[PDB]
Structures are given as C-alpha cells and as structure tokens.
Swiss-Prot record:
BP term (GO), one: response to antibiotic
Organism: Klebsiella pneumoniae
Active-site positions on this chain: 47 (acyl-ester intermediate)
NCBIfam families: bla_class_D_main, blaOXA-48_like
Entry protein name: Beta-lactamase OXA-48
Regulation of its activity: Inhibited by avibactam, related diazabicyclooctane (DBO) derivatives and by bicyclic boronic acids, via a covalent binding to Ser-47. Inhibited by chloride, bromide and iodide ions. Not inhibited by the beta-lactamase-blocking agents, clavulanic acid or tazobactam.
Reported induction: Expressed from an upstream promoter, P(out), in an insertion sequence IS1999.
Additional free-text comment from the UniProt record: When OXA-48 is present in clinical isolates of K.pneumoniae, increasing chloride concentration during antibiotic treatment reduces bacterial growth.
C-alpha cells in the first residue's frame, strides 16, 4: 500500500526547488511520498550507482576488500579529494568517480549488464560507454526502484555474496548516534537534463528500518546540501528522527 502526502511539498517549496521524497516503513510494509508520479519517474542514477558498482566489483574480485588501496593516477582533477589515494570507504565518502570508472572498465560490459539484470536494477540498460553510462548513458532508475533495490541489499537478498553486501553497507555508513544510523549514498546528475540530486538509503532504528529515496532539481551545485536537509525535515516531521 502507498499513500501520497503533498504536505511535504512545502519542504521543497520553502527552498525554491522541486523534488520527491519516498519513505518505506519496513515493519508495516507501507510507502509514503509527496508525489506519486515523480516517485516513479526514472532518472540517471549518477553516483548512487556506486552502490551496485561496488557490489559487483567486490563479488567479481575486482576489489579485494574495503582496505584495498586505489592509487591516484596523478591526473589533477577539480575535486581536491579525488587527487589522492582511496579505498572503498573513502571512494564512496568522497564519491570518487575516477575510481569507479576503473571498476566498471575491469568489470566489463558483459558482466555489468548481467549483474544489473540479476539486481533488477532500474531499466537494466548500460547503453553508452562502460566507464560513464551511469553519468550520461542510458541507465535509468526511479526513487521507488531505488527502494526495492536497497531493501534487497538490507536483507542480503541480492545475487551476490553476503560478504559483498555487508562490505557495501559498511561503506554506505553516513551518520550514527544514540538515536539512529543512516546508511546512504548521494547522487549528482548534470550531464543530462533535468539536473538532479539524489539521496537514497535507510534509517536504522532500534525496532524498525525506514528506507528513503529522494531526488530534487539541482540547477547549480549551490543547493547540494538540500538533498540531506530536506530528507531530514521529512524524517523529523514524521517523527522518525528527533
Ligand atoms: Cl557498519
């Protein structure tokens, strides 16, 4: 069952933007969103694709573990935190595109396509360049499709080893305190209109888990902090977090 709550539109409207938040209560098996249509509109996954990419790289042995170091290639890029060595944890934290481009090239078209079908991930279409299709290729995923994928991950039900899923969920760790844990991944899609920001993941509570997936219009990078801030207002409004 699903329920539309357009009162959340205020959180986007008060920040002069537009988007969708989708929540899923795992205990009650109920979904909630401000916009049923946009919740099912498919966009480029951009850096949210680092979740499945990590899973596949780990399960194929492209990545040995979360400690394996991927040395900087010496090419100075505009993101200072990309110009350094990374492991899976930091590559996810700083959303280091060049590291994941190399994963995909070593994964290869054939195995990447097969794995995304096995994950039932979005439209399962890797059309484009193998090292950038999630940035400007044909792959698409909706907010509700992110939920389904993330729920499988939470329950270790994806068609990779338990270890690979446990490692990726560790790398997704974003925030933890006495009240909740957030494991999540941001996304920023600019190469194809409309330009959007993503935030997908879940909130772990003592006795429940709330999966979430949001995207929002992102004409400039100035409003990137709104991906998390808007999501948290909805969570606070719904008394999921203090
Ligand atoms: Cl952990």
């Amino acid at each position: 069952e699903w329920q539309e709550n357009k009162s959340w539109n205020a959180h986007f409207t008060e920040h002069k933007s537009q988007g969708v938040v989708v929540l899923w209560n795992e205990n009650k098996q109920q979904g909630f969103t401000n916009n049923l249509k946009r919740a099912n509109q498919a966009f480029l996954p951009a850096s949210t694709f680092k979740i499945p990419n990590s899973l596949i790289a780990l399960d194929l042995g492209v990545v040995k573990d979360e400690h394996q170091v991927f040395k900087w290639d010496g090419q100075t890029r505009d993101i200072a935190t990309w110009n350094r060595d990374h492991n899976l944890i930091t590559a996810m934290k700083y959303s280091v595109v060049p590291v994941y481009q190399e994963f995909a090239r070593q994964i290869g078209e054939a195995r990447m396509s097969k794995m995304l079908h096995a994950f039932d991930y979005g439209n399962e279409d890797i059309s484009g360049n193998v090292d950038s299709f999630w940035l400007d290729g044909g792959i698409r995923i909706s907010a509700t499709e992110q939920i389904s994928f993330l729920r499988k991950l939470y329950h270790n039900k994806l068609h990779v080893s338990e270890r690979s899923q446990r490692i990726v969920k560790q790398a997704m760790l974003t925030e933890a305190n006495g009240d909740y844990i957030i494991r999540a991944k941001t996304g920023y899609s600019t190469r194809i209109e409309p330009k959007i920001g993503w935030w997908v993941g879940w909130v772990e509570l003592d006795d429940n888990v709330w999966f979430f997936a949001m995207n929002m219009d992102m004409p400039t990078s100035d409003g990137l902090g709104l991906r998390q801030a808007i999501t948290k207002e909805v969570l606070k409004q719904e008394k999921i977090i203090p």
